[PDB]
Each structure stands twice: as structure tokens, then as C-alpha cells.
Amino acid sequence: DVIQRLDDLKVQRNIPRAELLREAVEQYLEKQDRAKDTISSALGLWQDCEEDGMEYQRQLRKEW
């Protein structure tokens, strides 16, 4: 039924279903790329932070 929505999508678009997937697959992979980018620059973003995250957490749950 993903195949049906694909070809009634295709009525509108005038494009082979394989470009509908190399649309679908593409955009998705680009979305994953963006995440990878953000996470990579965050690591490690705190220059001078040696703290363990779980230790950190336990402190602020008891709030310092």
C-alpha cells in the first residue's frame, strides 16, 4: 500500500517511481547526515570539561 500511494502520487508527478524512491531514500539520508554533523561538533564541545555525565547528573538532581 506504500506502492499504491506511490503511483497515485505518480499521477500528479510525471516521474518514474524509481525517482520517487531516489527522492525518498535521498532526503532521508540527508536528514541522517545533518544529525551526524551536529553531534560531531558537539563532541566534545566543552573544552576543559572532564566531568562524568552520570556523576554530573547525580549532583544537579541533588542540585549543587
Partner: protein, 122 residues
């Protein structure tokens, strides 16, 4: 199929641990954090003077505010699992958005459905 991430994993990420990097890449974007986590992380950013760029990394997440019905669930969850209030709020956020909860806290959260622990350290 998305997850909500506890503060400890985000702290580990900014603190330069690949363990946290992999834990986040193990779930699809867009991921989510509680507004509580946002505050916990932004406190550390100030300490370490990255506050602007940390704010930009957090913005990629879905920052879920604490509502009245999240408040009601947290109250219940707190009694059920003997949770501290912030932990209950974060668990409530994940349940009401029907998200998996990713945390390194195995002491409080082990035996609670929908809570997954990606990695361990000393």
C-alpha cells in the same frame, strides 16, 4: 521510532565521550529532550563557557515543555517506581510522547518498560 535522551548522555557528549556519540546515532532524528534536561545542560555550558554553541546543539532536539498532564503522570510515576521528581518528569515526557527513554541510570530505571541503557563506564 524515536527516543528521548536523559541529561547524562548529553553531558557525556559535550564532555567528549564517543560513548554518547554512538548512543545518539543509534536512534533516528529528530530526537527529543525534556525542558528539564535543557536546563541541566545549559548550566554546564555556562560553567565551561560554551553557552551559545551548546544552545545551538540543543536546538536540533525536540525540547518538550513540562505540561499539566506531564505533571500528573510524573506524580503517579514517582510513587510507582520510587522515582525522584526530575526523573519522573523525564520518564513521563517519554511515556506521554510514547518515546523510548535513553539513560545511563540503571539503578533507578532498571525494570521499567521503555527505558534503554546504551553504554557503561566506571
Amino acid at each position: 521510532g524515536s527516543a528521548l535522551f536523559d541529561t547524562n548522555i548529553l553531558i557525556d557528549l559535550f564532555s567528549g565521550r564517543r560513548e554518547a556519540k554512538q548512543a545518539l546515532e543509534a536512534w533516528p532524528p529528530q530526537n527529543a529532550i525534556s525542558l528539564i534536561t535543557w536546563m541541566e545542560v545549559m548550566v554546564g555550558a555556562k560553567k565551561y563557557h560554551q553557552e551559545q554553541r551548546t544552545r545551538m546543539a540543543l536546538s536540533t532536539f525536540n525540547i518538550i515543555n513540562i505540561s499539566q498532564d506531564i505533571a500528573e503522570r510524573s506524580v503517579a510515576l514517582r510513587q510507582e517506581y520510587k522515582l525522584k521528581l526530575p526523573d519522573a518528569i523525564i520518564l513521563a515526557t517519554a511515556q506521554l510522547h510514547r518515546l523510548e527513554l535513553i539513560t545511563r541510570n540503571t539503578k533507578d530505571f532498571a525494570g521499567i518498560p521503555g527505558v534503554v541503557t546504551p553504554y557503561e563506564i566506571h
